[PDB]
Write a protein that binds this ligand. Sequence first.
Ligand SMILES: O=C1C[C@@H](c2ccc(O)cc2)Oc2ccccc21
Length: 212
Amino acid sequence: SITAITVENLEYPAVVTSPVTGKSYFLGGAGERGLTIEGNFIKFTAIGVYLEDIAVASLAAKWKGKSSEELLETLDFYRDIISGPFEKLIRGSKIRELSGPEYSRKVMENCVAHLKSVGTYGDAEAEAMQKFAEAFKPVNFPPGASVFYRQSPDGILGLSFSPDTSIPEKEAALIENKAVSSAVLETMIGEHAVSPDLKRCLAARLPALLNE
Ligand SMILES: O=C1C[C@@H](c2ccc(O)cc2)Oc2ccccc21
């Protein structure tokens, strides 16, 4: 039943399969991010969050039978999605052109704030974030180009870059750090993520799946 979602002419298929891990995912939600300039929301990128198919069985126990409205207001629900025992794939496709450094600046800012916020920002995490930064430096994201974050439940964050929206065969880098591995998704649907579009998609789409 899960449908595809299109954001600013950028389409997010209902399902995708990783060329890296071979695992298949379903679209949990899609939205957009940007900057508010002079009270005006300026869109820069689209974001899609895919959850490994096994996520359903994992989330079923605790969340089956809950209404979308109920899930949306429950922080614990999103915590299970962020740190659940399954892989998550996040695809960011640019609406406006951004260089790797330009784009990564904000993302890293948000990740670092979160990490410090929960008391897990030591030397290992700073080094992981520096490696994160390094991976983006040689990259440019013209409209339509994409970044793929593969959040492995084993504490690893795989980074892939594409000239368009197709998922690359090989990953550009592997950030091996547990706390950092979930930081990116946390800044998107975690408690302190202001933008609700992704959270709403998840709360709306998951109930149907959690019942069958
Ligand atoms: O996926 C993104 C894009 C990022 C961003 C937007 C505009 C820009 O110029 C640089 C980075 O903002 C964000 C903030 C929070 C969570 C995800 C994101």
